[PDB]
């Protein structure tokens, strides 16, 4: 502005937010995770079990056959192609997302790997080691190993390099953001999975009814090399009322808990003094030493490494080690399966002992009640798995299976003396089908609901679905609550109201998930900058060192953590270390934790420095920086590029995760909290907190909300449950989900005729593109009790406005049909069946079909009309209800239009699927006009249906002649406390009068008094009240009506799509009761609660009629000797017989439900004999 | 998608003022409120009709026609 070093204001933060969204976007986490996976993790996975060697020994049978061979198959680099599809005839061509969607093809690319096939041979002289030598046979080509689904708008997709004009040419919506997969033509999005972070020691308390008081557990996990998880638990046996409380640790493959002292001795620390040195680091913590006495007392008998090792070994469940391999087996267990996250190589027992001592020390602190049990809901201990890690582990499993199959083929060929064929040795279908199945279905194997069909009802719904997360719910905690650590990472208001409330979370606007990097460079840096190795750390001679942890691994200690942390922070700020790396310095606990693993949720914040020039702490970002940011923003529509990455590299913003948030102080705003330190009575009462140690500043508090919650105007003036309801409902409002709806073929689609952007808008919506694809309209709303037709959350709508086009929508419905070929004999064909050659053809009208069995677009269709005509052949010797003559040779399998739906056929396309069979897709348009049953809702949880529609002459009017487009009951305001609705109405009135967009961002300086002053400047009552007249008589209403524009949304629920009645209809084959489903003319359920209510009413006859006459009613014949209903009744001949009883004149008929008959027959099958008798045998 | 022909609330014809509104905004460098007042839209029901309209037909016209002639 004027000076390049002046402090910024609260308005300037939105420029930084805009730069952030320009660089990252809204599906940045999805795209980045998939890109990282495809770029690195594929090669990493293939570089684990690349080598498979099969050795054929000498097999000594004769002196002429003594050579031993060794065949080796190794995998090298991996190559990935562009998305391609192979047709049935074998022609392969590049595939685009539009064609994939239309043809139900999977958007995927092929994977190729270089394979080296070596063979060594050696002379196997008896009783000597072999010397394998290459036999000059080293073959080396690319082998197809399957197809990898490609996420849209990714580095491997065609649309990443496409411009706006290119997208328009390719029939793709520029506003589309990608982040999903196309499997079988259905868009699938991978919902992030929340799991507990590994390699972190967690101490928990156990309930009274148990022998364990405290347990310290670590789920040791290694991110690279084997992908298996091993859990280590240390339990403190005995309660506070016990005379001896010992500590025992559970090791894998041991079947029993071994004393910690014995484990230490097996690790090589025989002295009790050294064991206590490893556990307790203070010479005066006599309390902890006293609690440790029982452990050494228990482990007194063992006094040497060999005895401890054999003691551990004999407990293992191997039963192959007889008496001498026990020590080596225990050593191998303690080396490779004990704390694998530290290391798995020999010569690192000191680190294992120190880590075990650390775990025991934490457990003893918790037992002594110096620290509370670790919180399980802490978001810093949680990880979010995106599409990257999920596909990584799935590919790991599938590749292991593929390698196993390759080895099996090698063994089979070598043994059975067959020729080796690589095309059969490697089966690409393993990888291809595994990935396709895991993505098409939610079963993440060969967990549920990992993959869901992307919501395309509206743009905001799609964004929320792409930024949704899930948490799988034996656990002892309350994950459904909104934890404090969730601040700024997940939306506090957007969550389902059903059974998933609190388990399904939505990321905040500025939240991101780290992709992870290599920790080895950081380890080397720490080692070279004075991190003393843990192999020579003596606590007694340095009781001031800070323990350095990297990814949960205690790597060493440092003497000057202040300087170490200063250097590390400077490097991270200037960009030498990846910003996603988290660094926390627990000063009180003397710990320095560095986290590099992927899955950590973080968000950016401004950096606060002393800046002694002004004498007080201030933000590093200045008005010159903001000016350059805005210049770069507006030059696109040429100064040097200045982006969010430029800010990050200049160290003006910093990524912070939940764990690092534990050790920082954040100033809410720079307006008043940063400056060292009458008031308007209307402004909010804000607490300064008078703190002069701020280290960071929020970009803007309004960024804590999610995508759905960023549309609410003035959400801070609303009750939180109303905000949650609005977040849920805004995903069911009609809008314009995409601009290419005229070329997309979706099952169902809704498009508003005349979308309008809200008069009262929020600054966040600018980055959600709500002004480009709005879902709703600005209706003139009056809050009044006019006729009593808007009571109980109902509404009155203007029939004139409906006629002029208020809340009118287009409805597109798609039908798909295929020509199935059943074997070489049977095949179906699209045809226009005739009454003389087709059997069982529907009663509808076939006049609209053409010679190809399809209706041309633009033709009108109504209920029962056939839109796709198809026929299939039938086998002879099958007569149904007669009517089957030699003329009939085909049967109808046509697809009829829905009974209650009608419209005009819009677009019909014919193509071929992956198998080459002809299939067609037909789309039908319809117009939905508001009715007396349709549902509409505002942006404040106020939802209701149209009670009745009034014309303009009947609606109330003001002196200006303006009539309301919608009337809502005043009684909805007080109880729900949705003051945001009223404030939005007033702001919208002012905005419409002045020609501006209302600023309804949550936390700003806008006040009702200011809005009222602005409104009064326009010649209207300051509070929005207007004098109205009764439409029927024209007399002034005694009370004045709150009148103004308000943004209303049309929801997906329409009465015409729910109304259904049945007098009689089809019955299910099994129970012979009314079928389920309103689409099939099904009935309603008269459940147990209805039965109980009728019993209370005493309407026995009505209950019987409901259960018998309105449902299954069956007459059966029962024998008087046996109650069994096994009486053969020739009703035509008037004969009855119960074979087995040898009677024919002792038969009775009873009326019972077919369900009852089925139950009795099932019991008879299960060997139970329910005998029905028509006379009593015992007195009351 | 395209400018409504009539105002929903009162029925005033507003579909013949979209081009004039855009021209006033662009060439005359006039504010939205001033342009709306100059166009003869006095009631805020029509003011919102023209102020909050989103022109999606322009985006729809960017796609190549499905059928030629």
């Amino acid at each position: 502005f004027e000076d390049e070093s002046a402090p910024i204001t609260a308005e300037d933060s939105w420029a930084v937010i805009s730069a952030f969204f320009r660089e990252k976007g809204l599906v940045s986490q999805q795209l980045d995770s998939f890109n990282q996976f495809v770029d690195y993790t594929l090669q990493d996975i293939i570089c684990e079990d690349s080598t498979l060697i099969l050795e054929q020994l000498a097999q000594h049978t004769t002196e002429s056959d003594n050579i031993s061979r060794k065949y080796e198959i190794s995998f090298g680099k991996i190559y990935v192609t562009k998305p391609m599809v192979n047709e049935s005839d074998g022609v392969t061509h590049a595939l685009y997302p539009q064609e994939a969607r239309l043809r139900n093809l999977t958007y995927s690319s092929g994977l190729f790997v270089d394979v080296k096939k070596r063979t060594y041979e050696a002379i196997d002289v008896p009783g000597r080691e072999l010397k394998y030598e290459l036999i000059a046979e080293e073959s080396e080509g690319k082998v197809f190993i399957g197809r990898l689904p490609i996420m849209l708008r990714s580095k491997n997709c065609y649309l990443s390099e496409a411009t706006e004009s290119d997208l328009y040419k390719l029939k793709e919506c520029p506003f589309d953001m990608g982040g999903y997969f196309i499997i079988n033509g259905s868009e699938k999005v991978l919902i992030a999975q929340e799991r507990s972070a590994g390699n972190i020691v967690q101490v928990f308390k156990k309930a009274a009814p148990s022998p364990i008081s405290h347990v310290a557990e670590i789920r040791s996990a290694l991110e690279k090399g084997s992908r298996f998880i091993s859990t280590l638990q240390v339990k403190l046996y005995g309660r506070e009322g016990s005379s001896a409380r010992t500590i025992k640790a559970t090791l894998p493959y041991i079947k029993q808990d071994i004393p910690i002292v014995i484990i230490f001795r097996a690790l090589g620390i025989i002295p009790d003094g050294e064991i206590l040195e490893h556990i307790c680091y203070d010479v005066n913590d006599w309390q902890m030493l006293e609690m440790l006495k029982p452990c050494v007392e228990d482990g007194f008998v063992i006094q040497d490494r060999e005895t401890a090792l054999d003691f551990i070994g004999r407990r293992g469940t191997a039963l192959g080690i007889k008496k001498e391999k026990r020590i080596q087996y225990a050593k191998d267990i303690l080396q490779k399966e004990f704390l694998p996250h530290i290391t798995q190589l020999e010569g690192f027992e000191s680190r294992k002992a120190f880590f075990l001592g650390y775990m025991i020390n934490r457990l003893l602190l918790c037992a002594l009640d110096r620290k509370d049990q670790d919180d399980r809901d802490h978001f810093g201990k949680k990880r979010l798995d995106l599409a990257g890690p999920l596909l990584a582990q799935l590919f790991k499993t599938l590749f292991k299976k593929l390698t196993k199959d390759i080895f099996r083929y090698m063994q089979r060929t070598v043994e059975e003396a067959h020729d080796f064929n690589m095309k059969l040795a490697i089966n690409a279908k393993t990888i291809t089908s595994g990935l396709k199945y895991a993505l098409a279905t939610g079963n993440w194997g060969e967990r549920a609901g990992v993959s869901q069909v992307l919501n395309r009802y509206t743009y905001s719904s799609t964004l929320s679905h792409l930024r949704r997360t899930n948490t799988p719910i034996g656990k002892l905690a309350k994950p459904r609550q909104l934890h404090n650590t969730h601040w700024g990472l997940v939306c506090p208001a957007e969550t389902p109201e059903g059974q998933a409330c609190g388990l399904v979370k939505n990321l905040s606007l500025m939240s991101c998930i780290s992709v992870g990097t290599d920790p080895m460079p950081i380890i080397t840096f720490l080692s070279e900058w004075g991190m003393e190795p843990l192999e020579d750390y003596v606590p007694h001679q340095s009781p001031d060192a800070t323990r350095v942890f990297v990814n949960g691994v205690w790597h060493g200690v440092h003497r000057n953590p202040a300087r170490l942390m200063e250097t590390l922070r400077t490097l991270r700020r200037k960009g030498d270390i990846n910003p996603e790396v988290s660094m926390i310095r627990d000063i009180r606990e003397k710990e320095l934790k560095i986290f590099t693993d992927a899955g950590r949720v973080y968000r950016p914040l401004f950096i606060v420095e002393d800046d002694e020039s002004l004498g007080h702490k201030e933000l590093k970002v200045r008005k010159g920086h903001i000016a350059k940011l805005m210049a770069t923003e507006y030059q696109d529509i040429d100064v040097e590029e200045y982006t969010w990455s430029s800010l990050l590299n200049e160290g003006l913003v910093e990524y912070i995760d939940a764990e690092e948030e534990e050790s920082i102080l954040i100033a809410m705003q720079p307006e008043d909290l940063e400056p060292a330190e009458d008031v308007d009575p209307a402004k909010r009462i804000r607490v300064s907190h008078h703190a002069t140690t701020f280290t960071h500043c929020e970009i803007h508090p309004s960024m804590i909300l999610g995508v759905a919650a960023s549309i609410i105007p003035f959400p801070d003036h609303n009750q939180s449950p109303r905000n949650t309801y609005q977040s849920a409902m805004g995903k069911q409002a009609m809008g314009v989900f995409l601009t290419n709806y005229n070329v997309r073929m979706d099952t169902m689609a809704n498009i508003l005729y005349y979308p309008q952007k809200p008069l009262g808008t929020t600054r966040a919506m600018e980055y959600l593109k709500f002004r480009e694809l709005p879902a709703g309209q600005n209706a003139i709303v009056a809050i009044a009790c006019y006729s009593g037709y808007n009571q109980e959350d109902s509404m009155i709508m203007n029939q004139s406005s409906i006629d002029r086009g208020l809340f009118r929508s287009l409805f597109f419905r798609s039908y798909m049909d295929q020509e199935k070929k059943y074997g070489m004999s049977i095949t179906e064909t699209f045809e226009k069946p005739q009454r003389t050659n087709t059997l069982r053809m529907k009663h509808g009208t076939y006049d609209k079909l053409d010679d190809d069995g399809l209706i041309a677009p633009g033709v009108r269709v109504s209920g029962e009309d056939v839109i796709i005509g198809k026929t299939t052949p039938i086998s002879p010797d099958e007569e149904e209800l007669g009517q089957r003559t030699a003329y009939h040779s085909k049967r109808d399998a046509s697809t009829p239009l829905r009974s209650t739906e009608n419209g005009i056929v819009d677009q019909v396309l014919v193509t071929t699927n992956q198998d080459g069979l002809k299939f067609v897709k037909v789309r039908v348009r319809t117009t939905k006009i508001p009715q007396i049953g349709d549902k509409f809702a505002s942006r404040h949880g106020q939802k209701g249906t149209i009670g009745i529609t009034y014309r303009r002459e009947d609606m109330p009017f003001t002196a200006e002649g303006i009539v309301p487009d919608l009337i809502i009951n005043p009684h909805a305001i007080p109880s729900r406390m949705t003051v945001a609705h009223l404030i939005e109405c007033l702001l919208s009135k002012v905005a419409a009068l002045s020609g501006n967009e209302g600023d309804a961002s949550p936390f700003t300086d806008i006040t009702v008094e200011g809005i009222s002053k602005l409104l009064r400047e326009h010649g209207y009552q300051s509070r929005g009240f207007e004098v109205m007249y009764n439409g029927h008589t024209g007399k002034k209403l005694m009370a004045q009506i709150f009148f103004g524009p308000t943004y209303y949304q049309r929801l997906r629920h329409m009465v015409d799509d729910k109304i259904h009645a049945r007098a009689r209809g089809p019955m299910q084959v099994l129970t012979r009761q009314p079928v389920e489903g309103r689409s099939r003319d099904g009935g309603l359920r008269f459940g147990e609660m209805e039965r109980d209510c009728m019993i209370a009413h005493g309407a026995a006859s009505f209950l019987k009629e409901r259960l018998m006459e309105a449902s299954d009613a069956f007459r059966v014949h029962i024998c008087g000797i046996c109650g069994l209903m096994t009486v053969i009744a020739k009703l035509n001949h008037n004969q009855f017989e119960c074979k087995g009883c040898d009677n024919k004149i002792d038969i009775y008929q009873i009326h019972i439900p077919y369900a009852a008959k089925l139950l009795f027959q099932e019991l008879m099958a299960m060997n139970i004999t329910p005998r029905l008798y028509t006379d009593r045998s015992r007195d009351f | 998608m395209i400018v409504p022909v009539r105002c929903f609330s009162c029925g005033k014809v507003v579909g013949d003022k979209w081009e004039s509104y855009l021209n006033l905004l662009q060439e005359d460098e006039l504010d939205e409120g001033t342009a709306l007042s100059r166009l003869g839209l006095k009631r805020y029901c029509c003011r919102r009709m023209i102020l909050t309209h989103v022109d999606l037909i322009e985006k729809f016209l960017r796609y190549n026609p499905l059928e030629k002639r």
Partner: peptide, 19 residues
């Protein structure tokens, strides 16, 4: 005591002219 309007149509013009 504040401006409850989002000035974006001509704020870009103001900034560009200032440059």
């Amino acid at each position: 005591n504040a401006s409850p309007f989002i000035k974006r149509d001509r704020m870009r013009r103001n900034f560009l002219r200032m440059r």
